[PDB]
Each structure stands twice: as structure tokens, then as C-alpha cells.
Amino acid sequence: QPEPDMITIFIGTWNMGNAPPPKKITSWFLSKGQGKTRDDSADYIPHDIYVIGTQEDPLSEKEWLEILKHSLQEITSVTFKTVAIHTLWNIRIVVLAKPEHENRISHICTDNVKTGIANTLGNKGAVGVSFMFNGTSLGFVNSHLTSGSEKKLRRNQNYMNILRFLALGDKKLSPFNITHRFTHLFWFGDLNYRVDLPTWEAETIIQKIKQQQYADLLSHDQLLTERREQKVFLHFEEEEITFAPTYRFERLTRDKYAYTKQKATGMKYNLPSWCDRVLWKSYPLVHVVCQSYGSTSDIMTSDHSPVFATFEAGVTSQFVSKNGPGTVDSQGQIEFLRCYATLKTKSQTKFYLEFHSSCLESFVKSQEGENEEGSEGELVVKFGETLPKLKPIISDPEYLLDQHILISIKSSDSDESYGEGCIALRLEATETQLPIYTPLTHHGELTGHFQGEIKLQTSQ
Numbered sequence: 505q506p507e508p509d510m511i512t513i514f515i516g517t518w519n520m521g522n523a524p525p526p527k528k529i530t531s532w533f534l535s536k537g538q539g540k541t542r543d544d545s546a547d548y549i550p551h552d553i554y555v556i557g558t559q560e561d562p563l564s565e566k567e568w569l570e571i572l573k574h575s576l577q578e579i580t581s582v583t584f585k586t587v588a589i590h591t592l593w594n595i596r597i598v599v600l601a602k603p604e605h606e607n608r609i610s611h612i613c614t615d616n617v618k619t620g621i622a623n624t625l626g627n628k629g630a631v632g633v634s635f636m637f638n639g640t641s642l643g644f645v646n647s648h649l650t651s652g653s654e655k656k657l658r659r660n661q662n663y664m665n666i667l668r669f670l671a672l673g674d675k676k677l678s679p680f681n682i683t684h685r686f687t688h689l690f691w692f693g694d695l696n697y698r699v700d701l702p703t704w705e706a707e708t709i710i711q712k713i714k715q716q717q718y719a720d721l722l723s724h725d726q727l728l729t730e731r732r733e734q735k736v737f738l739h740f741e742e743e744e745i746t747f748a749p750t751y752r753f754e755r756l757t758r759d760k761y762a763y764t765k766q767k768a769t770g771m772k773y774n775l776p777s778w779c780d781r782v783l784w785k786s787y788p789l790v791h792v793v794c795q796s797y798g799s800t801s802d803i804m805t806s807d808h809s810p811v812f813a814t815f816e817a818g819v820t821s822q823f824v825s826k827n828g829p830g831t832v833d834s835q836g837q838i839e840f841l842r843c844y845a846t847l848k849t850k851s852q853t854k855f856y857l858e859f860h861s862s863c864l865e866s867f868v869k870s871q872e873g874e875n876e877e878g879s880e881g882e883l884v885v886k887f888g889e890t891l892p893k894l895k896p897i898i899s900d901p902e903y904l905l906d907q908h909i910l911i912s913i914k915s916s917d918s919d920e921s922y923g924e925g926c927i928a929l930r931l932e933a934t935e936t937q938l939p940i941y942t943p944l945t946h947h948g949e950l951t952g953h954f955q956g957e958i959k960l961q962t963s964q
């Protein structure tokens with residue numbers, strides 16, 4: 505039975521509004537309703553992995569697991585295995601996989617982050633799951649961010665706390681947050697970003713939704729505008745939105761948006777908004793294709809509609825050679841020529857690099873670079889041809905060209921990372937000097953750039 509080089513992944517996010525679900529929720533897992541929907545001809549074809557995020561979830565883990573497994577068994581006739589389930593308050597993540605994957609999945613991690621302080625600590629935050637699927641690391645974050653049209657900045661702060669403090673994936677990747685630890689990272693939830701239009705325009709917005717004319721509403725969506733201004737979710741993707749706003753509906757129909765201020769809303773308006781979202785970030789030049797992104801029309805127990813997204817995702821096999829794992833493959837090497845970091849920092853410490861990759865036995869520390877002043881104020885850290893030659897565990901090009909090198913630039917004075925990035929080894933050529941580049945981030949904000957040339961030697 506061959507190992508796969510692709511899988512499909514279902515992502516669901518649903519704020520259940522503290523109500524039990526209706527008896528049938530299969531439309532969610534079939535990617536049927538509004539938006540980019542899945543073809544009927546695929547209905548019996550199971551996804552490899554189903555990841556379900558809920559918010560305001562009133563059910564026990566047992567109760568929800570029984571509903572989810574029943575739903576999938578009815579669709580596919582397959583009894584899915586539970587990979588992980590984790591709940592913080594009423595925020596929950598469930599990961600289910602086809603039984604054939606049980607011995608492909610390992611290194612399962614769960615964690616949560618509580619956002620806010622005092623007043624603002626007690627119901628918002630995130631849960632997450634990570635695991636290895638053969639040679640591929642997968643991370644999944646379900647976040648319920650701060651509510652309210654005039655709290656976009658709080659949401660952005662919630663995002664940065666979650667990506668700093670959520671402890672998933674390989675703890676040896678100590679300079680790296682979740683935005684660099686996984687081949688594929690999916691971040692979804694009730695992100696609570698709103699359509700920023702005047703309250704007086706409520707009926708006009710409703711009119712536009714009835715006409716399926718979303719352009720003038722999406723141009724005011726806070727998540728799109730904050731992402732365009734690099735305030736949040738830097739270097740993440742989102743499929744184009746082609747479904748109606750998923751919030752805030754009257755329960756038991758989808759015919760009415762309930763937007764007017766009420767004591768129950770704290771006298772806040774809830775103009776129709778795309779609160780419920782799926783975003784992703786994959787390492788450079790790894791295959792990832794969104795094959796659906798939409799909302800269900802027939803699940804009406806909540807004031808939110810469920811959102812689905814499905815993905816094709818490239819995966820690699822757990823490679824064994826005669827040499828690695830457990831030694832180097834002298835036939836393989838990675839050289840960095842003429843590299844320099846450009847940093848936004850005002851500080852004047854010396855810097856060194858760390859190279860981390862599962863193609864190395866352990867991470868590699870460079871010598872200090874040479875600091876120069878850039879022409880427009882910047883710090884330029886030059887490494888020249890001083891960088892250590894990296895010795896991968898396996899030299900076979902079918903393995904090595906699918907790998908990635910994480911780079912951290914660290915202060916010699918503090919050993920703290922000033923920037924993290926990632927370089928693909930999916931090169932146009934081997935034994936050839938080729939340009940490389942990554943942006944550098946820290947706490948998920950842009951801090952600089954790393955660029956230079958690479959020369960990769962494989963056994964071919």
C-alpha cells in the first residue's frame with residue numbers, strides 16, 4: 505500500500521451560540537451551501553483528516569464526538585478515529601482521521617491560550633492541535649477572538665498572544681512560534697472581524713446581501729483591511745469569500761439578519777459580518793490548494809452559520825536510507841553564499857544565525873556576522889562565505905529537495921531571536937548558485953529580510 509504524496513483536509517468553524525446542533529449537520533462536512541462548494545460527485549469520498557473548531561459550544565466532548573463520528577459515518581460509511589480533542593471553556597477543536605492513517609500520525613500535541621487580563625480573561629482564546637503525518641508537520645488553531653465592531657485592535661492583540669504562546673509542534677524549534685513550526689498551519693475560528701460601515705447603512709447592507717453583491721461589503725471587512733495593512737495574519741492566505749456574511753442571524757431561519765442593538769448585545773449593533781474564517785500558511789513551494797470555502801444554508805440553531813474549507817495538501821514519506829536517520833550522508837551538503845540579513849532593529853549587538861531543519865541531526869549555529877549601516881538607516885548583517893556547510897542526514901534528491909531550512913537571527917548579547925524565516929530546498933537546479941530569500945518576522949511582525957545564494961549538493 506503506497507504512502508500518499510497528497511491528502512485532503514476538511515476545516516470547519518462554527519460558533520454554535522450555546523445551543524445544541526440540529527439532528528442533521530452533514531451539509532457542513534459535504535461543503536454544501538453558499539460560496540465555493542464541493543462537487544456532488546465527491547460526496548462519498550472521505551477527506552483524510554477532518555478538523556472541527558467550535559465556539560460557544562454547549563456540548564460535552566463525548567456528546568460532540570458522537571455527533572461528529574455519526575455524521576461522517578452516514579456520509580462516507582467510514583468510522584473515523586479520534587486523533588485529538590481539546591477544549592478551553594466553550595472553545596473546542598476535534599481532529600478525526602481515516603483509520604488507515606492511524607500509524608501515519610504521531611507526535612500529537614494540544615494546547616490552549618487564554619487572551620486578555622482580568623475583565624477580558626475568562627472566555628476568549630484559542631485551542632490547537634499539531635501532529636506529524638509521515639514526514640509532514642500539520643498545525644491547527646481554533647480561536648475565538650474579542651467581539652464587537654470597535655475592537656479590531658484587541659482582536660489583533662489576541663492574534664499576537666495566541667501565536668506567541670500556543671505551544672505546539674517540535675519544542676526543539678525554540679526560536680520559532682507556530683507560524684514557522686509546520687509544513688501546513690491552518691488558523692480558523694470566530695475571528696470576530698466585522699464589516700466596518702455606518703450603523704445607519706444596516707438595511708442597505710442587507711439589500712446588498714440579498715442581491716449576492718459582496719464587493720462593497722468585503723472592501724470594508726476588517727480582517728481583509730487589517731491584513732492588507734500588515735496588522736495581523738502576516739504571510740497567511742485566505743480563499744476569496746463568495747458566501748454571505750455568516751453573522752448575525754435570527755435563529756431557526758437564515759432569512760433574517762439580527763443586527764439592532766439589544767440589552768443582550770450590550771447595546772451594540774451587529775451589522776452582518778464575516779466573523780467565521782479559515783486561513784492558512786504553508787512552507788514555500790509546498791502544494792496547498794483550497795478546493796472549497798463556504799457556509800451552510802440549512803444549519804440554523806445558532807446566530808452564526810457554519811463555515812467549511814477543504815484543502816489538497818502535499819505530504820512527504822518517512823524517509824529511511826542506508827545512512828540517515830542516525831548518521832550524515834556525506835554525498836549531501838547545503839552551502840550559503842553572500843548571505844546578509846537586513847534588520848529593522850535600532851540595537852547594535854552582534855548577531856549569529858541558527859539553521860533548524862528535520863534534514864539535520866541537530867540545529868547549526870553560525871559565527872557572528874559583520875554589522876554595516878544601510879543607506880536608508882537599516883542594520884545589514886553580512887555573513888559572506890563564513891556560514892557553516894550544512895550536512896543533511898539523507899542525500900537522496902527525492903527527499904532533500906522537499907525539505908526546508910528555518911533561519912533565526914539571534915543577538916550574541918541576549919541569545920534572543922530578532923527574526924525567523926524559512927527557505928525551501930525545492931531548487932531549480934543542484935550544484936548551482938541560486939538566489940534565496942525569506943522575510944524575517946518576530947512575534948509574527950516583520951523585523952527584516954534574509955537573502956543570498958544557496959548551492960545544494962544531492963546524490964544525483
Ligand SMILES: CN(C)c1ccc(CNn2cnnc2)cc1
Pocket residue numbers: 548577578579580581
Ligand atoms: C460507495 N460508498 C462507499 C458509499 C455509498 C453510499 C454512501 C451513502 N450512504 N451510506 C452511508 N453508509 N453507508 C452508505 C456512502 C458511501
Ligand SMILES: [Mg+2]
Pocket residue numbers: 519521560
Ligand atoms: Mg455569540
